[PDB]
């Protein structure tokens, strides 16, 4: 997270860390048994770490649960970075508590202008901001017009831009799969962008609300 601020410990209870030897992606706990992330963060088996704040220090609050299933959206396309969403089934259900609590799926799609929060342990592009400590950042959803103008022809229905055309604040490498929460609802999943915090190149996020059907049907299929 570039240009953000350290989150108040445990203020983003749904925030998870995908580990496979080290932190490689983020994710969102949508319920005691499922986590939503990006399809490009796929791995046949991953360990999900919940209740984290500083990923490099044991805090007592954490839960390391292995995945039992990792399902990528069926229509995901790596070259287009299209339909960049996936679900991970926890081998043992998460214990919800003061540190581990799920995030609500979107009832409706959020409008351009909507202020949201994105968080993660990705690159901060700063020697002062410690990426091991969860970073938070408030970003507004941009209009499809500005989004498509920034990346001509690259924006599909499964995507939306959020950030600042002026640059300076954005999600970066290590933040993928992470949450974009607008008013208590999970609106997007950190996906891609050209560089990080570059003027004219805002971050692109997967559009969760256009996936409600697959999300729910899949979490019901065993």
């Amino acid at each position: 997270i570039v240009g953000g601020y350290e989150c108040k410990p445990y203020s983003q209870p749904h925030q998870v860390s995908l580990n496979s030897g080290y932190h490689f992606c983020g994710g969102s706990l949508v319920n005691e048994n499922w986590v939503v992330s990006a399809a490009h963060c796929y791995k046949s088996r991953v360990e999900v770490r919940l209740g984290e704040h500083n990923i490099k220090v044991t805090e007592g609050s954490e839960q390391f649960i292995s995945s039992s299933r990792v399902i990528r959206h069926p229509n995901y396309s790596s070259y287009n970075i299209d339909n960049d969403i996936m679900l991970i089934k926890l081998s043992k259900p998460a214990t919800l508590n003061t540190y581990v609590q799920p995030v609500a799926l979107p009832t409706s799609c959020a409008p351009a202008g909507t202020m949201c929060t994105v968080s993660g342990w990705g690159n901060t592009m700063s020697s002062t901001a410690d990426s091991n400590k969860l970073q938070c950042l408030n970003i507004p959803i941009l209009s499809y017009s500005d989004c498509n103008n920034s990346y001509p022809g690259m924006i599909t229905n499964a995507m939306f831009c959020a950030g600042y055309l002026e640059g300076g604040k954005d999600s970066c490498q290590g933040d993928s799969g992470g949450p974009v929460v607008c008013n208590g609802e999970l609106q997007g999943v950190v996906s891609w962008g050209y560089g990080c915090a570059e003027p004219g190149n805002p971050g692109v996020y997967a559009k969760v609300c256009i996936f409600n059907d697959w999300l729910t049907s899949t979490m019901a299929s065993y």
């Binding site: 490689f24 992606c25 990006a38 490009h40 970075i81 290590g174 993928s176 891609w192 962008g193 971050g203």
Partner: protein, 58 residues
């Protein structure tokens, strides 16, 4: 040594943090770099051995 061993490592647009290896011709060493997770180029290997067997020399 295939010519793709001389190209700079490419992180790509995705935002994951996946550690990969690439051949650094200036130092003549296979080193690590952060790959974003999509649109990988050829000077991008899963292990130092692959990198070495492929770009290590001629």
């Amino acid at each position: 040594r295939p010519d793709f061993c001389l190209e700079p490592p490419y992180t790509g647009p995705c935002k994951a943090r996946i550690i990969r290896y690439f051949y650094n011709a200036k130092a003549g060493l296979c080193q690590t770099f952060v790959y974003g997770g999509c649109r990988a180029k050829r000077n991008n290997f899963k292990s130092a051995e692959d990198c070495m067997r492929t770009c290590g020399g001629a």
